[PDB]
Symmetry: D2
Subunit: 106 residues, 4 copies
């Protein structure tokens, strides 16, 4: 999917996590976020169109999706324990990774 449509599924499943009532629903939504991030990993953002795929801005942009995937995985451990409320809080914290990359490249 294009970059805009991956961002949208990331933004929508964050909201779905806030309002969830059980672990299977948190699990479902985090899984969808992981696949969206993995698909986004290979795109070129508009603000970087004139750069080389080997350029440190592109390398840094890629790596931000690898950290996000790492944080979603750790949230997935807390849903499998039954510790649902912590899982929901770790999910909200993910905004930090979102904003840090938005500041440089959105």
């Amino acid at each position: 999917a294009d970059l805009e449509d991956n961002m949208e599924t990331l933004n929508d499943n964050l909201k779905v996590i806030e309002k969830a009532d059980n672990a299977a629903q948190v699990k479902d939504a985090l899984t969808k976020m992981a696949a969206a991030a993995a698909d986004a990993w290979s795109a070129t953002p508009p603000k970087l169109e004139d750069k080389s795929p080997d350029s440190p801005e592109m390398a840094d942009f890629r790596h931000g999706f690898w950290i996000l995937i790492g944080q979603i995985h750790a949230a997935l451990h807390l849903a499998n324990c039954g510790k649902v409320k912590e899982a929901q809080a770790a999910a909200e914290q993910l905004k930090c990774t979102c904003n840090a990359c938005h500041q440089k490249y959105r």
Copy 2:
């Protein structure tokens, strides 16, 4: 040291990282931050004085220092590679862990 004096050394070495010129100076300051966090790990904050050491607020408060120590360690890998500028950026990102705990417990 008391909680206030550990916070102060954490706050001061963040500023020292911004303005550093080489790897040995970033290394030095991150090391100091790690020891301050490890010393803070066992304190009771004012807003939690009436709670049991086994209580989920205390357990959650402790765990926030374990994540911070984990992030400082990863910043230390980037200073040892010579990749000084990335190390400085990972350091700024640490504010997220700072604020998230401040929101609940400062």
Copy 3:
């Protein structure tokens, strides 16, 4: 590719890493291992044919591939620093993750 062919590329590239002479060759071989491990992540092993895709043996089997990939990624940082020898040593340690999963499921 099938599970057998993925295991064979994993096994072959371990040997190529032992005998390498520069960082580009370590990098090339590690990259091929990551892609083999990502494809294998979605297979069903023979000894598990009679189980459900949601069953804790399957979920654990998947999870062994994620750890493998995380350790291959850290080895890739060591090759990009020019620290070739340390990279080679981190590659030999991967055997622990290979053997653990073979013990339960090969």
Copy 4:
């Protein structure tokens, strides 16, 4: 305590974990291993007596204790979920970190 006595508590508590019957006993033994590993973090091994405290053998030696501690911590999450058997299995995998460091420095 000295390095030898720390290794002996590490070795003893591995055996206690094998033979445990409930989560409180796994928890107790893992906790004693973490503290042994934290004390050992600042020792100098005999085979390294002639080296500088800033020397890459010493820095690598220290780093093996940090990884050990990180793997003991994750095992502690598994005991607190009530997933006792998985905890026991994660404890047996620690041998990989024990052996790797023995190969270079014992």
